[PDB]
Symmetry: C3
Subunit: 240 residues, 3 copies
């Protein structure tokens, strides 16, 4: 597997771990990073040494989203990345220690388990800069919290705090910020000692029932974002 | 756009507003005025100076609800397909299809004072307006059955906790908070909002159109059945047997 | 006529009560076959207006006792979803594994404050069956379904109400009387509006129930005849931590 700058990928004791490490950019994502994540997830599905996956961010925040600083390519890699999380025949754990915004939220909600810090908030930032949701957020969000709440995060984006995310059913768990790394470790270890084949078949089955709209949604997002990206309102969006 | 008795429609500042004005019926619905809402929503879909749509009711209540089915269905598909944010403004009770109209919208803003009730079943009918899908899509299947089979006035605050409503305000802050939200929408990117709303609807409302059809087929039968007669009558002044 | 299972019709009220209190209303194949047959019977019979499932004594059902088991689970679950009457689950205590699936296939779920829910399958090396891969998410959404399934915990009634998983919670000492009120109110309601209401919501929300049941069959078939299952059931029998290796 090829190494990628701003991204640490390690496999230890069946825990495939993928950490985005651009702590100066608040873990914003660039095409070659999105691409390495996609590659790693696709890789993880093929390696019989993998039992549990974990994706997270170093520093203060999980990810600020796609780097706001050819255009269709970013959308295609983001889509290829989400498909790969959703297909992966193991438990995927998103470790959300700080803020997650735009695509960061989508990546996390493509995952199977979402572990939040009291610190963390979530924001579907896209309309703030003249874009629409990406990475399947058109389905992934509503698949967890329902329609009205999805519509709300997307048209009236706001820093949704962890405690509220959990009460909406958007995250699996919230730990106090001083206990977070320890509680996350206990979750990974419980999963690591679980029935690997039953976990695989359970994750795939819930996803086949709850994500029948993922692919259609990725097709629309590609169609829609691709116009919005090459459009005037977004040039203004990125300026401010 | 033809003016319609019992309905006010305005295009001020890029804000398309539609208000049911029959505060004596508690904003009850008829063919002519349903038809009007429907026409106006279809109008607002292509008028290139519209940015945000707004449905609401005069006075105390939002709408107390009810051929009539078909025009309701046309109304609902028009909300769902409108390529702008449509906002439900619910200052007081919303009953029957009134609930369905509000839930078809994309943002539901509610007063401390507001209440939602799907009480078709009390009078021998089934839910309408796509409620057999719109409710579940927001709050899931178990809560949806509860409202349909065990109807109860659902105060705004619980509705919010469930997640069928976007926001609840105190009666005395209500209109001001509503206008901040509208104003917030007006400031936003109009094409990105249109694609966002339509994308989210395509993911969540795949069962809405078939639901409109099954409802039409079902009410049709139930509307010309004893249990409706008996149920309509016992509200006027029930013993159901079908 | 089935051992461990009482079926009764009253004044339009078809009760179905598992009676293996000793094992917390465990489910054998004969008995699963029974509830299934009973649910199918109740769709034909014009005297039936409301249907209640429950289990005797402390528990509701601890699920499958511890292949045809799955085919019949599936039959049962389809029979409940297809039933043109309100079907009520009366949960006075623990619900585990397919016990939960059965509850969640119902239309109305009434719980005691004593009750809890747990998708146990995974503690013993199985996947969710009985449509649980569709039915749980259909009520509470994907993140929560996945949590219950991958990190099973005893989810107490009251937290199940907040999630949207059940219709109502009652204090234990008030539970039986309250169930009765809800049953009677439904008895008094219009039967055909109810039937159509039920089926319309089911048809909008359970679009994936059938595909789920199929996947669950193909998946459990493999898992039940695997080494992780024996390790799990044994370890549960022994009140012991399992060591999985598959």
């Amino acid at each position: 597997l090829a190494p990628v700058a701003g991204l640490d990928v390690t496999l230890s004791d069946g825990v495939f771990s993928v950490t985005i490490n651009r702590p100066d950019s608040l873990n914003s994502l660039t095409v070659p990073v999105i691409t390495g994540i996609a590659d790693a997830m696709e890789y993880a599905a093929t390696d019989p040494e993998v039992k549990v996956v974990r994706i997270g961010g170093a520093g203060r925040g999980f990810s600020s989203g796609a780097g706001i600083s050819p255009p269709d390519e970013i959308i295609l890699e983001i889509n290829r990345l989400v498909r790969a999380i959703a297909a992966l025949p193991h438990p995927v754990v998103a470790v959300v220690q700080g803020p997650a915004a735009g695509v960061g939220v989508s990546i996390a909600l493509a995952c199977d388990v979402v572990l939040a810090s009291e610190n963390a908030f979530f924001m579907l930032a896209f309309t703030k800069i003249g874009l629409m949701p990406d990475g399947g957020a058109s389905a992934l969000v509503a698949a967890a919290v329902g329609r009205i709440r999805a519509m709300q995060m997307a048209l009236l984006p706001e820093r949704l705090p962890a405690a509220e995310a959990l009460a909406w059913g958007l995250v699996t768990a919230v730990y106090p910020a001083d206990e977070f790394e320890a509680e996350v470790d206990k979750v990974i270890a419980r999963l690591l000692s679980g029935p690997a084949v039953a976990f695989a078949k359970t994750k795939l089955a819930i996803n086949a029932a709850t994500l029948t709209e993922l692919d259609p949604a990725l097709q629309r997002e590609f169609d829609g974002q691709s116009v919005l990206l090459k459009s005037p309102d977004f040039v203004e969006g990125a300026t401010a």
